[PDB]
């Protein structure tokens, strides 16, 4: 089955399978399940197309899914790049933007130890 | 130390199993101060062993420790231009401690899910004399016996 992504890891509680979508994690899945009524503890192989089709409209009603969320993210960072602020310049240089120290860290934003 | 021996601290007998042995295994598997958790793990393993065999868990443990009791160690020494191992006798208490440590260490890195079934399988294998602790004891015994020439 597929709503936007695969959403169906084999032998997994759909509570955690909903976390596999781009836009829903633990809390979003919990609040969605609370609204819908279907219990969290159930194997994904037992889910049925009717439950899938009532779940499909809910996510697009208010939440968002793969593709457009990343489009908004990339548009945001691209606008930040083109406007030329301190954060935009840091993004252009690949350096972390939220005031983290750069003397001995930022290995995630940069690569591993170059050892020139 | 240099100023004589140090007395070893005593132990209490478990109300569930009135023997110092079970408390010794609980102490050996105890980590991070969770004595209750170690007791739970050892009790689950013992109950599993009793379920699989039928005989008394303390008797199975005694059979296992008698089977995995070693005789000699391979403590090494260096004199001149080379170092060689010296096989010496082992005291009963040290042998029991070494066998218990070996059993716990080999049960810790087994291919099962939880330490209840892990330790149950380990103690059953030691009782039948075919487990990892038995293999380690045989390897130690033979590799020490191979150094019988240097017995000073």
């Amino acid at each position: 089955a597929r709503l936007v992504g695969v959403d169906l890891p084999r032998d997994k509680r759909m509570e955690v399978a909903l976390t596999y979508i781009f836009g829903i994690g633990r809390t979003r899945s919990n609040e969605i399940l609370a609204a819908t009524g279907i219990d969290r503890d159930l194997r994904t192989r037992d889910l049925t197309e009717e439950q899938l089709i009532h779940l499909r409209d809910y996510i697009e009603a208010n939440l968002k899914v793969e593709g457009d969320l990343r489009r908004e993210v990339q548009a945001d960072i691209r606008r930040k790049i083109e406007i030329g602020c301190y954060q935009g310049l840091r993004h252009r240089r690949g350096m972390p933007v939220r005031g983290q120290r750069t003397k001995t860290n930022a290995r995630t934003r940069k690569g591993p130890k170059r050892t020139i | 130390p240099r100023k004589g021996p140090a007395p070893k601290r005593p132990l209490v007998n478990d109300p569930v199993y009135g023997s110092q042995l079970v408390t010794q295994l609980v102490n050996k598997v105890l980590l991070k101060g969770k004595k209750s958790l170690a007791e739970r793990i050892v009790y689950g393993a013992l109950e599993q062993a009793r379920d699989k065999t039928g005989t008394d868990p303390v008797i199975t443990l005694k059979r296992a420790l008698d089977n995995v009791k070693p005789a000699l160690e391979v403590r090494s020494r260096r004199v001149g231009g080379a170092t060689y191992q010296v096989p010496v006798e082992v005291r009963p208490d040290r042998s029991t401690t070494l066998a218990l440590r070996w059993l716990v260490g080999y049960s810790r890195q087994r291919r099962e899910k939880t330490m209840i079934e892990r330790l149950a399988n380990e103690i059953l294998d030691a009782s039948n004399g075919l487990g990892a602790s038995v293999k380690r004891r045989e390897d130690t015994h033979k590799m020490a016996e191979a150094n019988r020439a240097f017995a000073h």
């Binding site: - | 209490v12 109300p15 209750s36 007791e39």
Partner: protein, 127 residues
Amino acid sequence: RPIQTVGRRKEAVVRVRLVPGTGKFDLNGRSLEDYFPNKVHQQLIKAPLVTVDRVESFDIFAHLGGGGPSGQAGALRLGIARALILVSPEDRPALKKAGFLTRDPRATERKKYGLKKARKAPQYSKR
């Protein structure tokens, strides 16, 4: 006149009120199983009562305060031991040799400056 002694193990003090009875540990509304799920604690308590004789007799009740589970268990054990000693001076050699009368003074070592704990020291890292 009820028999009352002082019992401490690490930080807990229990005020025994030993009186004649059948024998059931009243610990302010919580039974032995309700309070202490540990078999070790459940043996440590009632060890002084069953160490010699006899055999599950008159109950005790003591207030609870401070320490933890093992500390409270040890304090209760010492309190029952001292109460038994006060009630009957004949069995004094029994508990006296059993070592249920010693306070067992053992407190946590105070932290010292320059060390990350009481005895644990920071990494040396010469040169």
